[PDB]
A paper describes a structure:
N6-Adenosine methylation (m6A) is a prevalent post-transcriptional modification of mRNA, with YTHDC1 being the reader protein responsible for recognizing this modification in the cell nucleus. The YTH family, comprising five proteins (YTHDC1, YTHDC2, and YTHDF1–3), is the best characterized family of m6A readers. Predominantly localized in the nucleus, YTHDC1 is responsible for the regulation of pre-mRNA splicing and mRNA export from the nucleus. In this study, we present a structure-based design campaign aimed at developing a potent and selective ligand of YTHDC1.
During the initial stages of the campaign, we identified that a chloride substituent located between N6 and N4 fits into the small pocket forming a halogen-hydrogen bond donor interaction with the side chain hydroxyl of Ser362 (C–Cl···H angle = 76°; Cl···O distance = 3.8 Å), which substantially improves the binding affinity. However, the adenine aromatic core cannot form a conventional hydrogen bond with Asp476, unlike pyrazolopyrimidine 1 moiety. Considering the synthetic challenges, we decided to pursue the optimization using 2-chloropurine 2b instead of 5-chloropyrazolopyrimidine 3. This approach offered the advantage of convenient derivatization at N9 of the purine moiety, as compared to C3 in the equivalent position of the pyrazolopyrimidine core.
Numbering used by the authors: 344 to 507
Write the structure that this text describes.
Amino acid sequence: GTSKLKYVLQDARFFLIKSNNHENVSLAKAKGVWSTLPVNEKKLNLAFRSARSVILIFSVRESGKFQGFARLSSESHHGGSPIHWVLPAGMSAKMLGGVFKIDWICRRELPFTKSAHLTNPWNEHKPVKIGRDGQEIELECGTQLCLLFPPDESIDLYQVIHKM
Ligand SMILES: CNc1nc(Cl)nc2c1ncn2C
């Protein structure tokens, strides 16, 4: 079924996350955390207070796919056992210092070929696959993109709904 999923996405906000490598997305799936650059960190903290759900939709660069989507369960927090992110060039551990907790909604992939009919009004109506890390996706486009993912039958949204 999709009814609880649609309830979680109701009036949600959506942000595109572009990860430079697969390792960090795998780590996020295993540990339920994400970290971003300070400019996007501030944006996500503001959104977390503003909406019933904030959804991160993940895409590893050069993969041609999205790798899933997750809901923020907290604002960013510092002061913890360092998440062993794989850092690309120019990326330092301090720039990824804020850790958001997230609850995965779908850990299944979706190829960009299946989202070619969705454009994002907040990025000049370019295909939704196009955008830098942190690009906000307008409500209707983000809802339809999330609904395109294959169902993840390993997940129970009952606990997510009560976090709302
Ligand atoms: C753990 N967070 C991240 N990991 C990698 Cl590899 N790239 C990122 C990123 N946040 C923004 N970008 C471009």
